[PDB]
């Protein structure tokens, strides 16, 4: 049994027990988050969306951790032009563990 | 009030331009002098009053008057 939901402007196909990394959410570590906009649920049979989101689809998840991703280095350079600039970046994330998928 | 606690007033001490020390500084390479010409050369530049070869203002205008000595 898997389901599709949208979180931080992106979509994820998940199943119960799977850990998924999302964009930073404003919830505490031990709290439970519910995603009510489920694009599709497929167990034995598949439930699509006449209109976006299945009628009674709810995905329950527990926040696991908040952190920053690996450092990326931005390099800008203009040859023969006496111009150079460097910058670093670490993107915030939120890991959640899928607990239950409700049809 | 200790010798490792005294601080200058804000704005009193400005740093100072250091030319030719890299791109990041903003004064690297040419050091604010532009490209070529007399004004970019070491010890280069024209004297006070020079306007090219055009007769300068202080020589285009006539002299006038005299010093009194009684005014002093
Ligand atoms: Mg510049
Ligand atoms: Mg040159
Ligand atoms: Mg030239
Ligand atoms: Mg010049």
* DSSP tag of B35: S
Residues in B touching A84 (Cβ below 8 Å) = 23-24
Specify the residue for token string 């002299």.
Answer: B63
Minimal-distance CA residue of chain B relative to A84: B23
d(CA A35, CA A60): 7
Closest CA to A100 of A64, A60, A63: A60
Q: By what technique were these coordinates determined?
A: cryo-EM
Kindly calculate the radius of gyration of chain B based on its CA atoms and give it in whole angstroms.
24
Instruction: Mark yes or no for CB contact B29/A82 under 8 Å.
Output: yes
CA B18 – CA B26 distance, rounded (Å): 10
Residue A3 CB contacts under 8 Å (≥ 6 apart), including other chains: A13, A14, A15, A38, A39, A40, A41, A42, A57, A59, A101
Q: In degrees rounded to 5, what are phi and psi of residue A94?
A: -135, 115
Cβ pair A47, A54 in contact under 8 A? yes
Resolution in A: 2.1
In angstroms, the CA A53 to CA A37 distance is: 5
Domain count for chain A? 1
What's the domain range around A52? 1-103
CA B10 to chain centre: 26
Helical ranges in B1-72 per DSSP H: 57-60
Contacts of B28 in chain A (CB under 8 A): 82
For residues A32 and A12, give the distance between their C-alpha atoms in angstroms, rounded to a whole number. 18
Question: Is the CB of A84 less than 8 angstroms away from the CB of B29?
Answer: no
Residues contacting A66, CB < 8 A, separation 6+: A24, A29, A92, A93, A94, A95
């Amino acid at each position: 049994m898997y389901a599709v939901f949208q979180s931080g402007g992106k979509q994820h196909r998940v199943s119960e027990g799977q850990t998924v990394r999302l964009e930073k959410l404003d919830i505490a570590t031990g709290e439970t988050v519910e995603f009510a906009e489920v694009l599709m649920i497929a167990n034995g049979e598949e439930v699509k969306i006449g209109v976006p989101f299945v009628d009674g689809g709810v995905i329950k998840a527990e926040v696991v951790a908040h952190g920053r991703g690996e450092k990326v280095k931005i390099v800008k350079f203009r040859r023969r032009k006496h111009y150079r600039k460097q910058q670093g970046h670490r993107q915030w994330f939120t890991d959640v563990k899928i607990t239950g998928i409700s049809a | 009030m200790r010798l490792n606690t005294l601080s200058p007033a804000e704005g009193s001490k400005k740093a100072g331009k250091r030319l030719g020390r890299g791109i990041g500084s903003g004064l690297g390479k040419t050091g604010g002098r532009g490209h070529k010409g007399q004004k970019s050369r070491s010890g280069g530049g024209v004297r006070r009053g020079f306007e090219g070869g055009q007769m300068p203002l202080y020589r285009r205008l006539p002299k006038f008057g005299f010093t009194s000595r009684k005014a002093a």
